[PDB]
Write a protein of this length. Structure first.
Length: 121
């Protein structure tokens, strides 16, 4: 149907906008602390602590499969990256501190992404 095509075009355009959002959030992580999944070889207990691991490469796979239907879904995954790190790592660590800085900086980006998603529809 033409209606199905129109919905697919909307999803594609959202995907474009989330790609640009993702690039901008990842730039706020120049150390690349959040770039890849935590290694279970190197942190064998990780899944005892963290139930839903998340990282930028995993978000990028989901994104390229057009797997985010709305901005809320994408934000959930971004929040997991931050929130997982802030639980596993102590306040005095470079990891936790990097998460705090990503959250704070990412906030700015997400604020305008929400307006753009609403605005363009």
């Amino acid at each position: 149907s033409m209606e199905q095509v129109a919905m697919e075009l909307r999803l594609t355009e959202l995907t474009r906008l989330l790609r640009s959002v993702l690039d901008q959030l990842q730039d706020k992580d120049p150390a690349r602390i959040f770039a890849q999944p935590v290694s279970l070889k190197e942190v064998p207990d990780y899944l005892d602590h963290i139930k839903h691991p998340m990282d930028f490469a995993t978000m990028r796979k989901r994104l390229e499969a057009q797997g985010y239907k709305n901005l809320h879904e994408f934000e959930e995954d971004f929040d997991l990256i931050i929130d997982n790190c802030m639980k596993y790592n102590a306040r005095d660590t470079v990891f936790y501190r990097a998460a705090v800085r990503l959250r704070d900086q990412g906030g700015v980006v997400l604020r305008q992404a929400r307006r753009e998603v609403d605005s363009i529809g």
